[PDB]
Ligand binder design. Structure first.
Ligand SMILES: Nc1nc2c(ncn2[C@@H]2O[C@H](COP(=O)(O)OP(=O)(O)OP(=O)(O)O)[C@@H](O)[C@H]2O)c(=O)[nH]1
Ligand SMILES: [Mg+2]
Lengths: 178, 195
């Protein structure tokens, strides 16, 4: 409806290099996908506005470097962040086992933040090594929701960003009451 | 003890900054080539990034600095002074730990004989802040200097009322400014002069 946003949130995407962090954002924001791999240097970002239950919500989405030598100062990633998207690759056992260190990094840097866990590259059943039921059970233990996605074929990407946007919106309404 | 505030009027100030940040971000395009991004961020290669900053961001930022700005302040040393956004810049860029660069920038824009106006100095200062990824840093530094704010602003001015009545809206403003620090700016401080 072209009005001024009702809410502004900052979302942060973190997780291992190669896991598809940029690809998730690029598909959500520009509806594009490329087989090309350009490693993210420091931070990139995208600004999009979504409609959620009649409310206009502006999202400032930060896409971080997976490679430690291209990571800029962690404090700067995290300042002012409302929601963190933690991404692993369902095809990489190693990307999954590092999820706990990313969760710990969130705790190191944030007091009160919404989180969501994303298993990307769910495109190739033959090479899937992180089974839904194990990831789901782990998500449950950490009190976060799980989304398995494919940036490649655009499956569950919108749903995922919608979820974390809803979480962040509900945390905001809840803090106002208290 | 009640301060009268129209939240929509204050929102208006932030909205203009929002619009400017959006235009500037749109200008940097969707290329993933850093070399292209640096070119788009260079005001000699892309005059347009200079135009966007000059015609959108600088006036939106100046309007924030002007909201409830006292016409005059009475200086302890100098006596009475016309009070302008540039006065607030002088106040909030004094040398100390963690602010050497910020002070250096004030000094270098102050010394340009090409500038000839306090509004032009203010604009060059903003161009400068973008180069050193510090526009948000400076705003936050300004906000946290309660002495500078009591000196230069009326209670209903945004930068003042931020502390009391609408701290969230000022948080929005800072958030809006954050991604400018991620953009490869290379702006001629004398861009306005060269037009
Ligand atoms: N099959 C498949 N490949 C994907 C998917 N998403 C990303 N890729 C590919 O995986 C590679 C890495 O993708 P990126 O989005 O750059 O991964 P990243 O997490 O941003 O990497 P860093 O910036 O280094 O941390 C690219 O070649 C992508 O095309 C997916 O959903 N399915
Ligand atoms: Mg990336």
């Amino acid at each position: 409806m072209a009005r001024d946003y009702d809410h502004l949130f900052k979302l942060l995407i973190i997780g291992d290099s190669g896991v598809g962090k940029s690809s998730l954002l690029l598909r959500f924001a520009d509806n594009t996908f490329s087989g090309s791999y350009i490693t993210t240097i420091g931070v990139d970002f995208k600004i999009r506005t979504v409609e959620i239950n009649g409310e206009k919500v502006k999202l400032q989405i930060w896409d971080t470097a997976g490679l430690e030598r291209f990571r800029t100062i962690t404090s700067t990633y995290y300042r002012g962040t409302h929601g963190v998207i933690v991404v692993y690759d369902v095809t990489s056992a190693e990307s999954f086992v590092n999820v706990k260190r990313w969760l710990h990094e969130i705790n190191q840097n944030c007091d009160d933040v919404c989180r969501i866990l994303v298993g990307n590259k769910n495109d190739d059943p033959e090479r899937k090594v992180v089974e839904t039921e194990d990831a789901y059970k782990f998500a449950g233990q950490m009190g976060i929701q799980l989304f398995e996605t494919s940036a490649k074929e655009n499956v569950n990407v919108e749903e995922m960003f919608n979820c974390i946007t809803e979480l962040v919106l509900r945390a905001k309404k809840d803090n106002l009451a208290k | 003890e009640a301060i009268s505030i129209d939240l929509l009027q204050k929102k208006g100030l932030v909205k203009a900054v929002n619009i400017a940040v959006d235009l500037i971000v749109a200008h940097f395009g969707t290329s993933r080539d850093p070399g292209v991004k640096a070119k788009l961020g260079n005001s000699s290669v892309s005059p347009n990034v200079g135009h966007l900053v000059l015609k959108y961001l600088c006036p939106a930022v100046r309007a924030v600095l002007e909201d409830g700005l006292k016409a005059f302040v009475l200086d302890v040393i100098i006596g009475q002074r016309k009070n302008m956004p540039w006065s607030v810049v002088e106040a909030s860029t004094q040398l100390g730990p963690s602010t050497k660069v910020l002070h250096g920038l004030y000094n270098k824009v102050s010394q340009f004989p090409e500038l000839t106006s306090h509004t032009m100095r203010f604009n060059a200062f903003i161009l400068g802040l973008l180069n050193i990824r510090s526009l948000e840093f400076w705003f936050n530094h300004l906000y946290n200097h309660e002495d500078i704010i009591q000196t230069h602003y009326q209670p209903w001015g945004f930068l003042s009322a931020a502390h009391t009545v609408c701290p969230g809206l000022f948080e929005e403003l800072l958030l809006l400014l954050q991604p400018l620090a991620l953009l490869p700016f290379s702006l001629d401080l004398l861009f306005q002069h060269r037009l």
